[PDB]
Every structure is written in C-alpha cells, then in structure tokens.
Amino acid sequence: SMLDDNRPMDFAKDKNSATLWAKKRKQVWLNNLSKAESTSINNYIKNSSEINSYSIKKKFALDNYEGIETLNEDLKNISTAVKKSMLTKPLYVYYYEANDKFGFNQNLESSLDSNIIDEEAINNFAKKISDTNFIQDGFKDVTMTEPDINSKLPILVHLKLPTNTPAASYGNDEENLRVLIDQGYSLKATGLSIVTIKGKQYAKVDADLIKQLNFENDVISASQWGEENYAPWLKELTSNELRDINNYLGGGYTAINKYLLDGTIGENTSKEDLEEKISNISSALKKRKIPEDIITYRRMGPNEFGLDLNSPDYDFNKVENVSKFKEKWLGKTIPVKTFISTTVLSNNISAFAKRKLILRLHLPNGSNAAYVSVAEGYKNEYEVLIDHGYSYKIDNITEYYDESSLGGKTNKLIIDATLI
Numbered sequence: 567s568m569l570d571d572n573r574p575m576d577f578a579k580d581k582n583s584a585t586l587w588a589k590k591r592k593q594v595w596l597n598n599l600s601k602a603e604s605t606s607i608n609n610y611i612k613n614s615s616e617i618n619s620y621s622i623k624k625k626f627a628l629d630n631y632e633g634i635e636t637l638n639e640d641l642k643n644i645s646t647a648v649k650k651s652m653l654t655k656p657l658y659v660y661y662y663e664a665n666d667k668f669g670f671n672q673n674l675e676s677s678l679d680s681n682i683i684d685e686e687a688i689n690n691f692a693k694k695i696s697d698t699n700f701i702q703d704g705f706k707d708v709t710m711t712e713p714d715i716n717s718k719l720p721i722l723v724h725l726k727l728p729t730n731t732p733a734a735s736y737g738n739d740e741e742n743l744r745v746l747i748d749q750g751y752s753l754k755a756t757g758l759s760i761v762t763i764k765g766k767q768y769a770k771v772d773a774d775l776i777k778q779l780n781f782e783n784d785v786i787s788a789s790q791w792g793e794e795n796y797a798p799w800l801k802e803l804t805s806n807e808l809r810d811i812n813n814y815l816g817g818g819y820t821a822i823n824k825y826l827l828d829g830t831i832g833e834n835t836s837k838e839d840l841e842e843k844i845s846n847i848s849s850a851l852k853k854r855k856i857p858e859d860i861i862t863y864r865r866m867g868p869n870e871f872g873l874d875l876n877s878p879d880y881d882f883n884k885v886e887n888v889s890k891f892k893e894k895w896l897g898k899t900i901p902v903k904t905f906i907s908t909t910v911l912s913n914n915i916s917a918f919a920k921r922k923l924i925l926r927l928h929l930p931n932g933s934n935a936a937y938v939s940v941a942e943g944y945k946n947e948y949e950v951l952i953d954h955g956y957s958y959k960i961d962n963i964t965e966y967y968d969e970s971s972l973g974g975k976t977n978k979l980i981i982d983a984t985l986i
C-alpha cells in the first residue's frame with residue numbers, strides 16, 4: 567500500500583524494490599485465497615503450459631464436452647485469485663517472445679552477425695505487428711524488470727498493464743518474482759525499436775494490454791449484446807430483407823454463397839432470383855454497422871483455403887503441414903466473395919464439429935454485419951452475418967489438438983484474422 571502508492575510505473579531494472587513490492591502484495595494476496603485457490607495457483611506454478619493449453623481445448627470444444635474436472639477448477643480458481651490482486655495504477659512488465667506469437671515467420675537475426683537484427687526483417691516485422699490486436703490465450707505470467715540474461719528468442723515485449731488489471735505477484739524464486747495476468751486480454755503494439763541486451767540485439771515491442779469484446783463461452787452476455795444492438799435492426803428490415811435473410815439462414819446459404827463464389831446456378835433457379843436474394847441480404851447487412859469492435863468465430867471448411875477434405879496438406883496431425891499452411895497464409899490478405907456466417911461464441915458447432923479451421927475474427931466497429939439471431943426462430947443461435955466482398959488479413963495461426971471423438975481427434979488451426 568505504502569509501497570503500492572510509491573512504486574514507479576516501470577521498475578525497469580530495480581528488481582530489489584520490485585521484489586519488495588511483490589513480496590507484501592504476495593503475502594497479503596494469498597491470505598485472501600481459499601484452499602482451492604492456493605492449490606490452483608500451486609498447480610499453475612507446476613504446469614502452466616498444461617493449464618493454458620487446456621483453456622484453449624475447453625473454450626473451443628463442443629457444448630457437452632466435460633473435459634478434465636481438475637483443470638476446470640484450476641481455470642476458475644486461478645482467475646478469482648488474480649482478481650484479488652488488481653493493479654492500483656499502471657505497471658510495465660517484461661517477457662521475451664517468439665516470432666510466431668506475432669504470426670511472423672521471417673528470421674530477425676541477421677545472417678552476418680547473430681548479435682544484430684536484420685534491417686529488412688525488422689521492417690517487415692513493423693508492418694506485420696501494425697493494425698493487429700494479438701489475442702493472448704490462457705493466463706500470461708511475466709517478469710517485473712528488463713531481463714538480464716540471454717534469450718534464444720528474437721523479441722522483447724515491454725507490456726503496459728492498465729490500472730485494475732488482475733496481476734498477482736507469485737513464484738518460488740523470491741528474488742526475480744513473476745506476475746500472473748488474468749485470462750481474456752490481447753496485445754496492441756505501441757512502438758518498435760532495437761534494444762541491446764548483453765551485447766545482443768532484440769526487437770523490442772512496446773505494447774498495451776487491452777481487453778477486446780470476446781464472449782468465448784458466455785452465452786448470456788452474447789445473447790444480451792445481440793439483443794441490445796440488433797433488436798432495433800430487425801425492426802427496420804423490409805419484408806423482403808427479412809424473407810431473404812431467413813431463407814439464407816435456413817439453408818439458402820448453400821446456393822447463395824456458391825453463386826457468389828463462382829457463379830454456379832442450379833437448374834431449379836435463375837441468375838435474377840439469386841441476384842435479388844443477394845441484393846436483399848446485402849442491403850440488410852448495411853443497415854446497422856457493428857457498433858464496437860468484437861471478436862467472432864467461424865468453423866471454416868478446407869475450400870476456404872484452397873484445400874479439399876482429402877488433401878495431403880489438410881492433415882494437420884503432421885507438423886510439416888501446419889508449417890506449410892503458416893508459410894502460405896500468414897500475413898496474407900484474402901478476398902472473401904461470399905457472405906460470412908460467423909458465431910460470436912467460441913463453442914464448436916455440432917454440424918461442423920470436424921472442420922479443422924477455426925476463424926477467430928477481429929470484426930471492427932463500422933463493419934457491414936448484423937447479429938441476425940435476434941430474429942424469431944434462432945434460439946441457441948448466436949450468428950453475426952457479414953456482408954459479401956470484405957477480406958481477411960491473416961494475423962496468426964495457432965495449432966491445438968482436439969482430442970474429442972466428435973471433434974475428429976485431430977490438430978486444428980485457430981486462425982486469428984482481421985476483417986478489412
């Protein structure tokens with residue numbers, strides 16, 4: 567408290583004061599902890615990687631995936647624990663980072679001198695980290711001061727945690743103490759420069775810890791947001807807009823998106839009938855722009871990335887195929903001719919349970935899209951339908967293993983993208 571009030575914003579290299587500051591708040595914090603919270607924080611110290619990987623499994627799973635009960639409690643308890651340790655004022659924190667957490671596949675090390683960052687590489691890196699909110703999965707533990715030792719990693723992240731961030735002081739090494747940050751945040755870069763540490767150059771990413779609107783498994787908040795923001799939208803629909811949205815949603819999407827993609831027409835119908843429907847849906851989707859940045863999701867089929875169900879390249883159980891996919895698509899901009907059916911929940915969908923490509927889309931304020939599930943007849947649905955003719959900017963690709971039978975017992979790819 568006295569030292570909470572008198573501490574700097576950035577401990578920089580003062581790890582003495584940092585550990586002192588850390589020490590009291592550490593003691594006081596755990597005396598607010600239930601037995602379950604202490605043991606869950608202890609579980610995080612012992613195997614953070616397993617807990618964090620599980621948080622990913624769980625949030626992307628099917629609805630009645632019951633998973634592993636211990637890790638469920640761990641996920642719940644770590645979160646309440648750190649929420650009892652909120653920052654009184656901003657805190658800068660530090661960690662070395664791998665380029666794939668920025669979706670960057672180019673080597674930053676110059677080929678001439680390993681102590682020196684490559685100029686063209688870091689210029690490409692500057693572009694890649696711009697205009698992107700980098701979602702951070704699981705809990706993120708960090709350090710209070712600029713590292714004083716080598717890393718095999720190319721990047722140093724200098725991250726600004728805002729006031730009231732759940733950020734608990736913890737660890738075993740009681741000099742060099744760590745900071746445990748709650749789930750649910752993203753990274754937004756605020757600057758880039760080269761920093762020399764122990765004779766070696768690293769790419770220093772200055773960034774802010776920000777919180778994006780991302781419902782993940784929270785159906786109640788999702789439903790409430792949809793209702794609040796798109797109930798008036800549903801009112802303003804012309805009878806033909808309502809009809810053709812409902813037609814699309816009830817199965818018309820198959821012929822409509824097929825036509826938009828490459829002009830295929832069934833012998834049953836006509837160009838004019840398809841165009842009219844596309845006209846009505848698209849005019850509808852322009853009537854109330856997305857009111858705030860939101861994260862939304864899509865179970866994508868292989869065709870959306872030029873693959874077939876039986877393409878060798880679609881076997882992500884092989885590391886080489888994940889690498890190929892990352893090399894092909896990271897940093898790319900992909901035109902999307904179709905309307906985009908998305909769901910604001912991270913939950914898997916039964917009809918699409920085995921699709922291996924999971925879009926995690928940053929949908930900006932101002933996008934021509936609507937929460938169409940406000941309409942009558944879409945209970946259990948949480949869809950945001952996006953207008954045709956936008957593009958995906960591919961920001962990251964993150965593999966995880968869906969171990970479930972219904973999910974397909976396969977590696978899947980979380981494809982972080984920005985709608986442009």
Ligand SMILES: NC(=O)c1ccc[n+]([C@@H]2O[C@H](COP(=O)([O-])OP(=O)(O)OC[C@H]3O[C@@H](n4cnc5c(N)ncnc54)[C@H](O)[C@@H]3O)[C@@H](O)[C@H]2O)c1
Pocket residue numbers: 814815816817819820823824827863864865866867868869870871902903904907908909915918949950
């Ligand atoms: N995650 C989702 O897929 C999702 C989300 C919300 C709602 N829905 C609901 O499910 C139904 C829509 O199913 P869907 O998502 O399979 O429909 P879709 O028309 O998007 O996809 C049908 C097939 O076409 C392919 N495809 C789609 N867009 C493509 C493109 N731009 N390039 C190449 N291929 C493309 C897909 O991979 C898929 O195999 C609707 O009833 C909708 O309300 C689905």
